[PDB]
């Protein structure tokens, strides 16, 4: 395949880019790194920022999950119709990243003591994305414009993992709730989300969700 994903055996920060690749009908190789292999240290020392994912597109080696998303967005035409839309796509993705960082901090560093406060704060964190949908064709299409973007896949993943963390959290957000259902029903993505290579990976690496 032209693409290789090098990552731990979790969904994590590769979930969105995998959904993107699958929904776009692209082929890729998964190179699985166990935490054991990672402890040996040689792969880690060779990674630019000491972390995974690592991604290959031919001889182009990338690190940083959002760099991979933007690269696929640019090369597959999932980055808006013009410069204005591209900026709005970035604005969405940066918002998704901010909330993802808070989610990851909760999962890996403070789950038991922090979950109540996190869930309490969650509606205020989701509301900006509902607002964005409400300002774009009544929320009937995508997060920006009338074609899918890499930010849709990232936002979709963020919403899916938050439904596991806080079941019912989208009940207060009709546009986000319908958006999750609509994107999840896209045939190639629906098949991917139902497949063992997605279903049989945990969301995170520490057993919490």
Ligand X SMILES: COc1cc([C@H](CC(=O)O)SC[C@H](NC(=O)CC[C@H](N)C(=O)O)C(=O)NCC(=O)O)cc(OC)c1OC
53 touches ligand X by CB under 6 A:
yes
Residues β-bridged to residue 56 = 4, 61
Q: Are 29 and 1 in contact (CB under 8 A)?
A: yes
What CA–CA distance (Å, rounded) separates 158 from 67? 17
Closest residue to ligand X in the complex (CB): 205
Q: Which stretch binds ligand X (CB under 6 A): 10-18, 132-140, 174-182, 185-193?
A: 10-18
DSSP character for 58? T
**Residue 65 in tokens:** 């999950």
Binder to ligand X among 114, 123, 128, 205 (CB under 6 A)?
205
Q: Which is nearer to a second copy, 70 or 162 (CB)?
A: 70
Q: Which is nearer to a second copy, 49 or 187 (CB)?
A: 49
Q: Which residues of 59-69 are buried (b: 16+ CB within 10 A; e: fewer)?
A: eeebbbbbebb
Q: Which is nearer to a second copy, 147 or 184 (CB)?
A: 147
What is the contact surface with a second copy in residues (CB under 8 A)?
48-50, 60, 62-64, 66-67, 70-71, 74-75, 83-84, 86-87, 90-91, 94-95, 98, 101, 124, 128, 131-132
């Amino acid at each position: 395949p032209p693409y290789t994903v090098v990552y731990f055996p979790v969904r994590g920060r590769c979930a969105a880019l995998r959904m993107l690749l699958a929904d776009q009908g692209q082929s890729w190789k998964e190179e699985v790194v166990t935490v054991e292999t990672w402890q040996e240290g040689s792969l880690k020392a060779s990674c630019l920022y000491g972390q995974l994912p690592k991604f290959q597109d031919g001889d182009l080696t990338l690190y940083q999950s959002n760099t991979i998303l933007r690269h696929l967005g640019r090369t597959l035409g999932l980055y808006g119709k013009d410069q204005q839309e591209a900026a709005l796509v970035d604005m969405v993705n940066d918002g998704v990243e901010d909330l993802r960082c808070k989610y990851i901090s909760l999962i890996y560093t403070n789950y038991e003591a922090g979950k109540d406060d996190y869930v309490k704060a969650l509606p205020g964190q989701l509301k900006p994305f509902e607002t964005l949908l409400s300002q774009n064709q009544g929320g009937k299409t995508f997060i920006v414009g009338d074609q899918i973007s890499f930010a849709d896949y990232n936002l979709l993943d963020l919403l899916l993992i938050h439904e596991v963390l806080a079941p019912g959290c989208l009940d207060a957000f009709p546009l986000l709730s319908a958006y999750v259902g609509r994107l999840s029903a896209r045939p190639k993505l629906k098949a991917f989300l139902a497949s063992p290579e997605y279903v049989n990976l945990p969301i995170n690496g520490n057993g919490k969700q």
